[PDB]
Amino acid sequence: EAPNQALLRILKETEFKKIKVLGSGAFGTVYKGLWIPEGEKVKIPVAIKELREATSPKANKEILDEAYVMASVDNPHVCRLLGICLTSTVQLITQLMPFGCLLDYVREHKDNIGSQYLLNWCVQIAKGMNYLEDRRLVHRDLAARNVLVKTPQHVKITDFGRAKLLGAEEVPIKWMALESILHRIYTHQSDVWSYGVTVWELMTFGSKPYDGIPASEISSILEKGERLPQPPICTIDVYMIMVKCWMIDADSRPKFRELIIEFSKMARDPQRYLVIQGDERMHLMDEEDMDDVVDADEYLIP
Numbered sequence: 063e064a065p066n067q068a069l070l071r072i073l074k075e076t077e078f079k080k081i082k083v084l085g086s087g088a089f090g091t092v093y094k095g096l097w098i099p100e101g102e103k104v105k106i107p108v109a110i111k112e113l114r115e116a117t118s119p120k121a122n123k124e125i126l127d128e129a130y131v132m133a134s135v136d137n138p139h140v141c142r143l144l145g146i147c148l149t150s151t152v153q154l155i156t157q158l159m160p161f162g163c164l165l166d167y168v169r170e171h172k173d174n175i176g177s178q179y180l181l182n183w184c185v186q187i188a189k190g191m192n193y194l195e196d197r198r199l200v201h202r203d204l205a206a207r208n209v210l211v212k213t214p215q216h217v218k219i220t221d222f223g224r225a226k227l228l229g230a231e232e233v234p235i236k237w238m239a240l241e242s243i244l245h246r247i248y249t250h251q252s253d254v255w256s257y258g259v260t261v262w263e264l265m266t267f268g269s270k271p272y273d274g275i276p277a278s279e280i281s282s283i284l285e286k287g288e289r290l291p292q293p294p295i296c297t298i299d300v301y302m303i304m305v306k307c308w309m310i311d312a313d314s315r316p317k318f319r320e321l322i323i324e325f326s327k328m329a330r331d332p333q334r335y336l337v338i339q340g341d342e343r344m345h346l347m348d349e350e351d352m353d354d355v356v357d358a359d360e361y362l363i364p
């Protein structure tokens with residue numbers, strides 16, 4: 063096993079001004095902010111995850127696990143850790159994805175989202191996931207709520223709160239492979255099952271899977287052979303790919319490298335694959351001292 067030589071960067075609380083809350087409640091609090099690294103003459107828009115004040119050693123072991131995972135990943139379709147702040151309670155600091163998570167974004171823009179975008183998202187999330195697979199990570203929680211939007215054309219997987227290495231042994235029912243609900247087996251192929259669901263969230267513009275059906279029923283339904291319905295905008299070509307991510311025999315499901323390929327072919331002729339009313343005509347941030355703003359993606363460390 064190759065040694066993990068990622069750099070964990072500790073950041074001074076004076077290097078960054080918080081600027082607004084974005085998401086209170088549950089777990090903790092997520093902020094928009096700006097980060098001015100040491101003496102460098104850049105300002106980097108960031109999100110800051112400072113778990114709900116109470117410092118129970120429990121949740122500390124959990125956020126540092128994320129930190130560990132997020133600091134070890136490096137790919138355009140995966141959200142990177144910029145560093146941590148050891149304040150009183152550990153802050154996670156990461157590139158701001160200003161448009162929020164892809165669930166909310168499709169929910170809120172159904173009338174404006176073309177086939178080109180939906181298939182590109184699919185291609186990009188597959189690349190993300192394929193990258194994790196290369197680094198032997200199993201995400202264990204892929205869902206449209208965990209994909210963030212940097213621009214409507216550029217999404218990245220986030221939330222590594224349950225990532226683990228393959229082999230390692232160390233709850234979202236509706237996105238989980240059957241072997242996982244039955245036996246807590248979890249493989250790159252159980253991730254692919256959740257890709258399946260994630261894709262289905264996007265083609266239904268934000269629907270909740272098995273809306274109604276309560277979690278206890280789920281593994282039964284699935285054993286009976288039921289899956290999610292073909293969404294209205296989906297050609298059978300697209301829906302057949304979802305279906306395959308949902309095959310009982312886990313090795314029977316597609317590999318992420320195959321998904322990249324298939325959606326990518328599809329994205330070359332989007333209207334052949336997704337049928338959306340109005341498709342041909344669809345089209346898709348503060349202070350004055352913005353002279354020195356640089357996106358994290360353009361801020362590299364030796």
Ligand SMILES: CCN1CCN(Cc2ccc(-c3cc4c(N[C@H](C)c5ccccc5)ncnc4[nH]3)cc2)CC1
Nearest residue numbers: 084109110111154155156157158159160161162166170
């Ligand atoms: C109708 C849409 N509505 C208004 C606009 N947004 C508000 C919003 C904007 C950005 C974010 C956001 C969260 C986030 C984020 N969160 C993850 C969990 C994170 C992980 C480690 C460290 C910090 C954050 N990471 C990076 N960029 C981010 N941006 C969340 C909500 C969505 C809801």
